Write a protein that binds this DNA or RNA. Structure first.
Ligand SMILES: [Mg+2]
Ligand SMILES: [Mg+2]
Ligand SMILES: [Mg+2]
Ligand SMILES: [Mg+2]
Ligand SMILES: [Mg+2]
Ligand SMILES: [Mg+2]
Ligand SMILES: [Mg+2]
Ligand SMILES: [Mg+2]
Ligand SMILES: [Mg+2]
Ligand SMILES: [Mg+2]
Ligand SMILES: [Mg+2]
Ligand SMILES: [Mg+2]
Ligand SMILES: [Mg+2]
Ligand SMILES: [Mg+2]
Ligand SMILES: [Mg+2]
Ligand SMILES: [Mg+2]
Ligand SMILES: [Mg+2]
Ligand SMILES: [Mg+2]
Ligand SMILES: [Mg+2]
Ligand SMILES: [Mg+2]
Ligand SMILES: [Mg+2]
Ligand SMILES: [Mg+2]
Ligand SMILES: [Mg+2]
Ligand SMILES: [Mg+2]
Ligand SMILES: [Mg+2]
Ligand SMILES: [Mg+2]
Ligand SMILES: [Mg+2]
Ligand SMILES: [Mg+2]
Ligand SMILES: [Mg+2]
Ligand SMILES: [Mg+2]
Ligand SMILES: [Mg+2]
Ligand SMILES: [Mg+2]
Ligand SMILES: [Mg+2]
Ligand SMILES: [Mg+2]
Ligand SMILES: [Mg+2]
Ligand SMILES: [Mg+2]
Ligand SMILES: [Mg+2]
Ligand SMILES: [Mg+2]
Ligand SMILES: [Mg+2]
Ligand SMILES: [Mg+2]
Ligand SMILES: [Mg+2]
Ligand SMILES: [Mg+2]
Ligand SMILES: [Mg+2]
Ligand SMILES: [Mg+2]
Ligand SMILES: [Mg+2]
Ligand SMILES: [Mg+2]
Ligand SMILES: [Mg+2]
Ligand SMILES: [Mg+2]
Ligand SMILES: [Mg+2]
Ligand SMILES: [Mg+2]
Ligand SMILES: [Mg+2]
Ligand SMILES: [Mg+2]
Ligand SMILES: [Mg+2]
Ligand SMILES: [Mg+2]
Ligand SMILES: [Mg+2]
Ligand SMILES: [Mg+2]
Ligand SMILES: [Mg+2]
Ligand SMILES: [Mg+2]
Ligand SMILES: [Mg+2]
Ligand SMILES: [Mg+2]
Ligand SMILES: [Mg+2]
Ligand SMILES: [Mg+2]
Ligand SMILES: [Mg+2]
Ligand SMILES: [Mg+2]
Ligand SMILES: [Mg+2]
Ligand SMILES: [Mg+2]
Ligand SMILES: [Mg+2]
Ligand SMILES: [Mg+2]
Ligand SMILES: [Mg+2]
Ligand SMILES: [Mg+2]
Ligand SMILES: [Mg+2]
Lengths: 50, 63, 78, 100
RNA sequence: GGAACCUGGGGAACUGAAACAUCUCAGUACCCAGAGGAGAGGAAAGAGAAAUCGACUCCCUGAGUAGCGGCGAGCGAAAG
RNA sequence: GUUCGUGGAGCCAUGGGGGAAUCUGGGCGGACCACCGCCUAAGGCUAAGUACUCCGGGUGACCGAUAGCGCACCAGUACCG
RNA sequence: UAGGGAAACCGAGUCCGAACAGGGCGCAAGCGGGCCGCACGCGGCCCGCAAAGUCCGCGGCCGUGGACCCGAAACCGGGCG
RNA sequence: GCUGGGGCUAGGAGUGAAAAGCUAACCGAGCCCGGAGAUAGCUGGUUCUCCCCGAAAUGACUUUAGGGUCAGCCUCAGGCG
RNA sequence: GGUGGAGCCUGGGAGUGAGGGCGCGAGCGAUAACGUCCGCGUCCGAGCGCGGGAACAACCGAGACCGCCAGCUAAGGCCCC
RNA sequence: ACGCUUGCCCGGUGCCGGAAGGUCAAGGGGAGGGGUGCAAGCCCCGAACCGAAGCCCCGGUGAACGGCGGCCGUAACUAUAACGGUCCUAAGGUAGCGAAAUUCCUUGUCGGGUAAGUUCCGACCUGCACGAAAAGCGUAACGACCGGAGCGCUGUCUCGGCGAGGGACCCGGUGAAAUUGAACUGGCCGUGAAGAUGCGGCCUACCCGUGGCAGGACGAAAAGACCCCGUGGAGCUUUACU
RNA sequence: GGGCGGUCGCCUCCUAAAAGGUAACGGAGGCGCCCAAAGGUCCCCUCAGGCGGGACGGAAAUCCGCCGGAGAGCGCAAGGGUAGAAGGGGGCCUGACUGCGAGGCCUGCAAGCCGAGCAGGGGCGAAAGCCGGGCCUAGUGAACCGGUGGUCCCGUGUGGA
């Protein structure tokens, strides 16, 4: 709460999200991630401000 | 006069043919963040035990 | 002059749920344990909270023997 | 009333659309009927007959749909299922849809 | 002026929601006006999907359906 | 008001402000736009079918003077205010 | 008498889903059963008014109505002083 | 100052050298009728006989502990054996 | 082994959710309470029907279908009421 | 009524004034977007900016609401404060009173009144918690107000007695009332829901009355007038909500 | 008894009577979190202390040898368990996946938890095999009304909104 900055990871090309946090206090800024979408078959993922 | 169908029940549950009452699981709509794929995914129309004898009473005229 | 501390937690209700000499199915929890008081033997799998269950069905047996911990053995029927 | 607490009916959520303030969209519907059940009587079977034979309440339109064996005879309906076309296809000639 | 009925103008509160302020009770009881053996309404600037019905009133259906509602209590059509 | 509690909120009347046209004019078919259908508002009247019983009569698995309307009787009287 | 699905839509299958994985809903499981039609797959038959449901009666219980009865402190409307 | 006669003021109102006094023998908001057979989880009462079985005062929750929903305990009917 | 108002499944129908005594295992209390709250069992409640304990619901025996001018016993007694 | 006064502070609130400044509604204005239509057109939004009252901010107002302190050292032991340093500080109670309709400790201490005074009177100040127009201190007269003392006299009392009338009592006449389970209703000791006429044991007691006392029948009256509960109802308050 | 005070949810130990459960205004304590590593796989090592010493050094810094079998540590209070790792160090990655889920523990219901295994596509390891977060138990909130993306399902005569 108010340190975690709970967010969701975007498809980075079209649509989906992944719903896991990234801290604002510790400099974990712009963390790339590979995750499993439905259609695009294990492409890369990045953050969103929501 | 003729009794009235409980519209909350009509919009929330769905009675089947053989008396069973089918309704969704809870703990899913508000916050779903810190939950696994199991806890997000397993919302699979739980069944209600010994309450449908007091739940098909307000699903009454059209069932 | 008031009550300092009068609260207590709800019990999670652990314990041995399937003793030996009992016919089981694939998936029955043999013991709900807090720590791993029982170690897995044949056809026994652990989970997240150290809970071990049966992989196949059959007559279960305990205590193959010690020096490493208590054992659970789901032995199949032939 | 499950006492003063929230009842089990209220604790579980709702799914379907409630609708808008004009109401529902008055669209026609389909009525599936078993081809092992309307194969009793004989003739070029249509509406104005099967709605008189006991089934088929005088409303929306119908379609022939069942799991069973059929009799070779003519049938005029609005729709057919992708198995009753083959179960009815045995010495059976039919129009697939009416005037529309 | 007239036992009851009807139309128009005002119009509540207890109760129900096991409190309760929106809501229900209820546009009910009650107050006023005029007319009647009934009153009101009435010949579409209608209804709503079929190129359809064809003034209005009342009963049974449609149907406690569609819908409205701290989507709670509960209220509740219209077409045909 | 209609089921419509301001919701996407139509239609019917309007308390106030702006404010025309007369069939190549308008309104409606539920925010709204185009097509396609329905009807003429801003004037008025209308029997019949429907509600009720002061009163008339016939009926009643209606009652029989603590019942039945408050009163079967010289009752909305004696009496209280 | 066919049900799933929020609906579209489909249907002895529907939905979740890329999917015949898998699961939730229903489905067919046979009661009276001379059925030997002569192929022991017996197809289905005399045949219990039934799986199968509807209409009426009579009971228990329930909801809306005052709802087993009696009893308030109070609130509002119209009036009398 | 006291008092006769004719008047005015009224119910969330009147009046009050102020007590919340008085307003038709009872005023921290009169009286009569109607809503209203208001509500009461709060007291009391609940009427003939015989037979069979037979409780509970426990657990999980409730602006809730004197009342509740489900389970436990009991009875009836239909099935398993 | 155990045919018993034993069990298991479905449906209908209530009531109960102020309990208390006794023995043991305990907490609080003061190793006090016919004190409070649990568990293991019984009884009263619902057996204030019976005998004993002088009288008394839970201390003991005993589980009252009715009747008899019949016996045997349980707890308790045998000097008299 | 009247004699002497109303001293301290405008920080919070109420109020008054404010052509500087922040915020803000309806509304005006509108870049830039959205829907639809072949387009002409129509219908939705719309950020900049302007835009009163009110709120914020400044000053004033205390016979406006409201309040007015603690701590450490110093004089021939004690005491100080009149002096030196701090502030939750806006400000630390001035005059005048004071164990008072104020004081818990307390019946504080001293003196008067009494032989004896938790009351009273006058001071001391150690004011839990007086106090200046919710006014402070006194005041001639007055009060069916309260408290204290004394005087002559009285049954009020020590300590009662007697007499008179109207009742009470008897008789003649009329003759109710609330209460009420039926009662053929003894005492003690125990038991019983823990206060017995009814239960057990012992003792006493012929039946029925008349006058009186009120100890009992947990006597009567009012469904506790104190306390608690009811998601009871009302009256009142406010910066509780609308 | 009410008021004043304390408490209202979750976790740990006891009370709690050797299955589970079990109360009191009974005792002792914690929580409304945190980790892109404090996660997965693979590969190495075994701790804390005591003794004999040291160059400063508190008797504790850092180093060597012996004894030391778990008295350390495992993010956090307490309990269980752990060196035949879950502990410490390094490489590579994000399975801190998506659709399901047989069979269960417990529960009045709602909830909470374990989950072998199927498909797609991955990570580690040569493979066998593991990975659907954290050694575990606390770290949270049913429902309703709405906000932001995708889905193009409905969209009130028709096409769109
Ligand atoms: Mg129906
Ligand atoms: Mg009327
Ligand atoms: Mg009207
Ligand atoms: Mg109301
Ligand atoms: Mg209510
Ligand atoms: Mg209404
Ligand atoms: Mg007239
Ligand atoms: Mg008239
Ligand atoms: Mg007529
Ligand atoms: Mg007429
Ligand atoms: Mg007329
Ligand atoms: Mg007319
Ligand atoms: Mg006309
Ligand atoms: Mg009609
Ligand atoms: Mg509206
Ligand atoms: Mg209009
Ligand atoms: Mg107008
Ligand atoms: Mg218009
Ligand atoms: Mg329109
Ligand atoms: Mg006209
Ligand atoms: Mg008549
Ligand atoms: Mg009479
Ligand atoms: Mg007679
Ligand atoms: Mg008179
Ligand atoms: Mg399936
Ligand atoms: Mg299946
Ligand atoms: Mg069948
Ligand atoms: Mg019935
Ligand atoms: Mg007078
Ligand atoms: Mg009134
Ligand atoms: Mg007033
Ligand atoms: Mg006045
Ligand atoms: Mg009076
Ligand atoms: Mg009164
Ligand atoms: Mg009444
Ligand atoms: Mg009413
Ligand atoms: Mg109730
Ligand atoms: Mg019996
Ligand atoms: Mg029950
Ligand atoms: Mg039976
Ligand atoms: Mg039994
Ligand atoms: Mg209770
Ligand atoms: Mg209880
Ligand atoms: Mg108990
Ligand atoms: Mg007791
Ligand atoms: Mg005791
Ligand atoms: Mg018994
Ligand atoms: Mg007795
Ligand atoms: Mg005895
Ligand atoms: Mg007894
Ligand atoms: Mg017997
Ligand atoms: Mg003998
Ligand atoms: Mg065009
Ligand atoms: Mg254009
Ligand atoms: Mg244009
Ligand atoms: Mg005077
Ligand atoms: Mg005397
Ligand atoms: Mg006299
Ligand atoms: Mg006499
Ligand atoms: Mg006694
Ligand atoms: Mg006797
Ligand atoms: Mg006696
Ligand atoms: Mg006397
Ligand atoms: Mg235990
Ligand atoms: Mg035990
Ligand atoms: Mg790890
Ligand atoms: Mg390892
Ligand atoms: Mg469940
Ligand atoms: Mg960890
Ligand atoms: Mg339209
Ligand atoms: Mg359209």
């Amino acid at each position: 709460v108010r340190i975690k900055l709970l967010l969701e990871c975007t498809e980075c090309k079209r649509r989906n999200y992944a719903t896991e946090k990234n801290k604002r206090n510790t400099p974990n800024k712009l963390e790339l991630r590979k995750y499993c979408p439905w259609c695009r078959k294990h492409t890369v993922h990045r953050e969103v401000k929501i | 006069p003729k009794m009235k169908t409980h519209k909350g029940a009509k919009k929330r549950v769905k009675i089947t043919a053989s008396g069973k009452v089918v309704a969704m699981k809870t703990g899913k709509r508000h916050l779903n963040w810190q939950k696994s794929g199991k806890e997000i995914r397993q919302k699979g129309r739980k069944f209600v035990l010994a309450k449908p004898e007091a739940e098909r009473i307000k699903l009454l005229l059209p069932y | 002059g008031s009550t300092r501390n009068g609260r207590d937690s709800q019990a999670k209700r652990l314990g041995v749920k399937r003793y030996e000499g009992q016919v089981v199915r694939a998936g029955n929890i043999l013991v709900r344990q807090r720590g791993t008081r029982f170690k897995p033997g044949k056809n026994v799998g652990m989970g997240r909270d150290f809970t071990l269950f049966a992989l196949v069905d059959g007559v279960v047996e305990f205590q193959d023997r010690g020096r490493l911990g208590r054992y659970v053995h789901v032995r199949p029927l032939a | 009333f499950e006492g003063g607490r929230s009842t089990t009916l209220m604790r579980l959520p709702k799914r379907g659309m409630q609708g808008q303030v004009p109401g529902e969209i008055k669209r026609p519907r389909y009525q599936g009927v078993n081809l092992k059940d309307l194969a009793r009587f004989e003739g070029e079977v249509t509406p104005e007959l099967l709605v008189r034979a006991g089934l088929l309440k005088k409303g929306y339109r119908l379609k022939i749909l069942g799991e069973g064996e059929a009799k070779p005879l003519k049938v005029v309906a609005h729709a057919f299922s992708k198995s009753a076309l083959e179960k009815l296809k045995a010495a059976g000639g039919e129009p697939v849809l009416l005037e529309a």
